[PDB]
């Protein structure tokens, strides 16, 4: 089974290799800068005293670690080979899976947190504490470990037509456990998060549209337009950034596709789109947060 090593036979052209290179470089730089800026502002100014800032910092840390794997992936694409050895293969793959799930589970938590605030305001008094935010981050990390730890054992370098593939090795039969992993990744990293955020935000908007305030209906319609607009943005960004690579992985598990320039370029673009979610999360969840905005 191929993983990082892409069957590229038919050496790349000039414009495509530069494009894929600029892709990995730009997403990495933007992702690292935006998330380190969030972590700096939190550590320097806001101080992480609130549940919201505890979630924001956890999201920025995961998003920074996710994009920190891109220099390895770029070089792996350039040379058409993994040159960093067996230990770094285990470390980068584990970090990559750990922080895909940590990033995604944290932004799901922020959706559930806002749903609880609106639809269960009494229970929100118990849930929205800094103590519970740290507990939730730990529980989400334990859940992420169900895949992040096994891939540390499964990941290894093996020879593949002279070149080196940093890939995963599975128990027997490989065709069962490899596809189970792909399915579990698809449902825990994409299907479940899309369901959580659409239902939580949808129920949040429905509750906000049901209030009738005897006086200022204009002020209510205005806030509802802004909240509904933000809901549509954060959901559309998640779907645009994560759907392509998840569907691409499933299709390659089912059929064999003709190795062409368009397939190669689209594959790395879909990979890059997944990491662009880590680039946009600082905007959606930190710089546009109501309290974080004020502290700039």
């Amino acid at each position, epitope marked *: 089974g191929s993983h990082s090593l892409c069957p590229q036979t038919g050496s790349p052209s000039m414009v495509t290799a530069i494009t894929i290179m600029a892709l990995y470089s730009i997403v990495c730089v933007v992702g690292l800068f935006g998330n380190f800026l969030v972590m700096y502002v939190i550590v320097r100014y806001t101080k992480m005293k*609130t549940a919201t800032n505890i979630y924001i910092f956890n999201l920025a840390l995961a998003d920074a670690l996710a994009t920190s794997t891109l220099p390895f992936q770029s070089v792996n694409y350039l040379m058409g080979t993994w040159p960093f050895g067996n230990i770094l293969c285990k470390i980068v793959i584990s970090i990559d899976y750990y922080n895909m799930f940590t990033s995604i589970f944290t932004l799901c938590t922020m959706s559930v947190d806002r749903y609880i605030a609106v639809c269960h305001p009494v229970k929100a008094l118990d849930f929205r504490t800094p103590r519970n935010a740290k507990i939730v981050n730990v529980c989400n990390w334990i859940l992420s470990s169900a895949i992040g730890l096994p891939v540390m054992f499964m990941a290894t370098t093996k020879y593949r037509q002279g070149s080196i593939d940093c890939t995963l090795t599975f128990s027997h039969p490989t065709w069962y456990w490899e596809n189970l992993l792909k399915i579990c990744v698809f449902i825990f990293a994409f299907i479940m998060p899309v369901l959580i955020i659409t239902v939580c935000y949808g129920l949040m908007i429905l509750r*906000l549209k049901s209030v*009738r305030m*005897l*006086s*200022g209906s204009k002020e209510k319609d205005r806030n509802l337009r802004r909240i509904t607009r933000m809901v549509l943005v954060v959901v559309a960004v998640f779907i645009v950034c994560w759907t392509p690579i998840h569907i691409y992985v499933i299709i390659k598990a089912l059929i064999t596709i003709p190795e062409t320039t368009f397939q190669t370029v689209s594959w790395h673009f879909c990979i890059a789109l997944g990491y662009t979610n880590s680039c946009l999360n600082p905007v959606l969840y930190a710089f546009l*947060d109501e*309290n974080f905005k004020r502290c700039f």
Partner: nanobody, 115 residues
Framework: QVQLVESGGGLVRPGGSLRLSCVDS??????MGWFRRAPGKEREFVAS????????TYADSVADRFTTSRDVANNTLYLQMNSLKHEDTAVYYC??????????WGQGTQVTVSS
């Protein structure tokens, strides 16, 4: 005009908990802020929350111990106070905004933290 009804105050031992609530049942205003005045101090901001109930704002002195929420369905404002200290002994005031700084203030509720 507007009548803010504050509830839940009173006496608690140090380290105990209190839940304040504030309602404007006439829907003529939105209770959204909590202030307090210690016996010898000036009036100080405690917590506030947006109309949507989504985004609370806490004073640094209480961020680790207090939580606020808003029931948008019945226009009720809540303040959950945990791990109460002597420095939390004060009169707590509910503040509300008119649908059209705050426009209305409750008469206050005494919170006294004593052994």
């Amino acid at each position: 005009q507007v009548q803010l009804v504050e509830s839940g105050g009173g006496l608690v031992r140090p380290g105990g908990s209190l839940r304040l609530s504030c309602v404007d049942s006439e829907r003529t205003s939105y209770p959204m802020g909590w202030f307090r005045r210690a016996p010898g101090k000036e009036r100080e901001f405690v917590a506030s929350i947006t109309w949507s109930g989504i985004d609370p704002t806490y004073a640094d002195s209480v961020a680790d111990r207090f939580t606020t929420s808003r029931d948008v369905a019945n226009n009720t404002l809540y303040l959950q106070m945990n791990s109460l200290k002597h420095e939390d002994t004060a009169v707590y005031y509910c503040a509300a905004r008119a649908p059209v700084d705050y426009d209305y203030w409750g008469q206050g509720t005494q919170v006294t933290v004593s052994s």
